């Protein structure tokens, strides 16, 4: 009801890092960012014991965590629980992402998202539909049964539900360009991924409307001498964002800093996280298979990487600590960049007046201490 100021902290506003300043938050909104010694006399205050204050992290790829997987329990309540799981690692907003499955599976996630975001804003900001219209040669874990080409019907559906769908990942090389443009028209972000595309194919795709790559280096045509492939295409195109899993397992760290020099503010940190993340587990079911959690990594019984358990705060940390990217910039790859990429950046991603109070607080050891969501404080 009354305002409160966060206080005693290094503030990463996204344009500046400020010492001896504070943020007054008013309801669900930030009111000012100003020098500590300007706060009104008996303004309520929260001492952050000198920790770091950034906007809450935005994950654009998250299959589930907190011990759940959106694909099994495709319900509004699964979303809810992942949301709270996120919060324990400073992630305040995300795309409940649903991997390649039945048309009917698709129809209910549409509902699940619709139900949730009627109830709560700025948390799940739309679905990420990853598949099914992919390429079998770059299938990953995505069942050889539900991968298909794009039919007119189910795109028509996706478009009619654009108001709850944020992003689709698809493999352009053999689906209608119509379908890409249609989704873009509909205000949906179309991402290339899981694709055996040629450089020139991806380029066409971009030109039809694709503006995002999902998990760069994962299930894509690698860049080779005579064939730039998809990673080539992405490097060569200024307007396309690329998500990247920085967990030391999916892509090699060197590849991430090379990627960051090329792509700068178009590189986005992504978890592609799975059940284990934010939880404690022995194993789980990634549509079908048993994925053991073995001290940080996901692994099918051979020890072959199974999936991701990355947390958003870990992603930032690793970027700073292994990739060599400065903290402020790494923060941005977890916040401003994804916001921009899904066009929510007018209200999230930045600590500035008028914007939504979705902040995160963490210590120098990359421990998330607390979380403010829509103005709500929580530890």
Residues that bind a copy of itself (CB under 8 A): 17, 320, 322, 324-326, 328-329, 364
Nearer residue to a copy of itself within complex by CB, 327 or 368: 327
Q: Which is nearer to a copy of itself, 300 or 328 (CB)?
A: 328
Cβ at position 326, least distance to a copy of itself in Å: 4
Binding-site entries? 130, 141-142, 194, 215, 218-219, 226, 247-250, 305-307
Q: Is residue 342 within 8 Å of 348, Cβ to Cβ?
A: no
Describe the strand order of the beta sheet including 91-99 as a list of residue ranges: 57-62, 91-99, 127-130, 165-170, 189-192, 212-213, 241-244, 267-269
The minimum distance between CB 17 and a copy of itself, in angstroms, equals 7
156 phi/psi in degrees, rounded to 5: -50, -45
Minimum distance from residue 328 beta carbon to a copy of itself (Å): 5
Min CB(359)–a copy of itself separation in Å: 20
- Report which of 214, 216, 178, 219 is spatially closest to residue 197, judged by C-alpha positions: 219
Adjacent-strand bridge partners of 26:
29
Instruction: Output DSSP code: residue 188.
Output: P
Distance CA 289, CA 26 (A): 47
Nearer to a copy of itself, 110 or 330 (CB): 330
Which residues are registered as beta bridge partners of 127?
165
272: annotated active-site residue: yes
Contacts of 295 (CB under 8 A, 6+ apart): none
Contacts with 39 (C-beta within 8 Å, 6 or more apart), sequence order: 5, 7, 22, 24, 45
User: Looking at 28, 156, 236, 272, which residue is catalytic?
Assistant: 272
Q: Quick one: which of 8, 104, 93, 109 has its CA closest to 49?
A: 8
Structure token pair of residue 137? 């040669």
Closer CB to a copy of itself, residue 137 or residue 254? 254
Q: Which is nearer to a copy of itself, 283 or 366 (CB)?
A: 366
In the complex, minimum distance from the CB of residue 317 to a copy of itself, in angstroms, rounded to a whole number: 13
Q: Which of 205, 271, 269, 194 is nearest to 236 (CA)?
A: 205
Binding residues for a divalent metal cation: 130, 194, 215
8 A C-beta contact, residue 32 and residue 39? no
Question: Residue 176's closest CA among 197, 205, 145?
Answer: 205
Q: Which amino acids are annotated catalytic?
A: 272
């Amino acid at each position: 009801n009354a305002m409160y100021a966060l206080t005693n902290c290094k503030i990463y506003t996204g344009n500046d890092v400020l010492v001896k300043h504070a943020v007054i938050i008013n309801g669900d909104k930030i009111e000012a960012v100003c020098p500590i010694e300007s706060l009104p006399s008996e303004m309520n205050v929260v001492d952050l014991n000198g920790a770091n204050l950034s906007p809450g992290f935005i994950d654009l790829q998250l299959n589930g965590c907190g011990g759940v997987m959106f694909n099994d329990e495709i319900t509004a309540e699964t979303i809810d629980t992942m949301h709270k799981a996120n919060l324990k690692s400073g992630c305040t907003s995300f795309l409940p992402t649903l991997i390649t499955s039945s048309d009917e599976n698709m129809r209910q996630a549409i509902a699940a998202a619709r139900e949730y975001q009627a109830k709560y804003p700025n948390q799940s900001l739309g679905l990420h539909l990853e598949g099914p219209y992919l390429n079998v040669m770059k299938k990953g874990i995505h069942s050889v049964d539900f991968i298909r080409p794009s039919d007119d019907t189910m795109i028509d559906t996706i478009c009619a539900n654009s108001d709850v769908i944020a992003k689709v990942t698809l493999a352009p090389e053999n689906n209608k360009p119509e379908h890409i443009e249609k989704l873009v028209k509909a205000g949906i972000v179309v991402s290339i991924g899981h694709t055996n595309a040629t450089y020139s194919e991806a380029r066409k795709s971009f030109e039809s409307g694709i503006t995002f790559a999902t998990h760069l280096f994962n299930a894509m045509t690698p860049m080779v001498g005579r064939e730039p492939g998809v990673v080539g295409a992405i490097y060569d195109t200024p307007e396309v964002y690329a998500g990247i899993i920085a967990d030391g397992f999916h892509v090699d760290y060197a590849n991430i800093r090379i990627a960051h020099k090329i792509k700068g503010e178009k590189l986005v940190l992504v978890t592609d996280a799975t059940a284990p993340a934010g939880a404690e587990m022995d194993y789980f079911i990634f549509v079908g298979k048993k994925v053991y959690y073995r001290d940080g990594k996901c692994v099918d019984e051979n020890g072959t990487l199974g999936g991701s358990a990355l947390t958003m705060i870990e992603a930032v940390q690793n970027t700073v600590e292994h990739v060599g990217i400065a903290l402020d910039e790494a923060l941005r790859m977890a916040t401003l960049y994804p916001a921009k990429a899904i066009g929510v950046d007018e209200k999230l991603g930045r600590i500035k007046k008028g914007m939504i109070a979705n902040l995160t607080v963490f210590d120098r050891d990359f421990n998330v201490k607390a979380t403010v969501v829509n103005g709500q404080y929580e530890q």
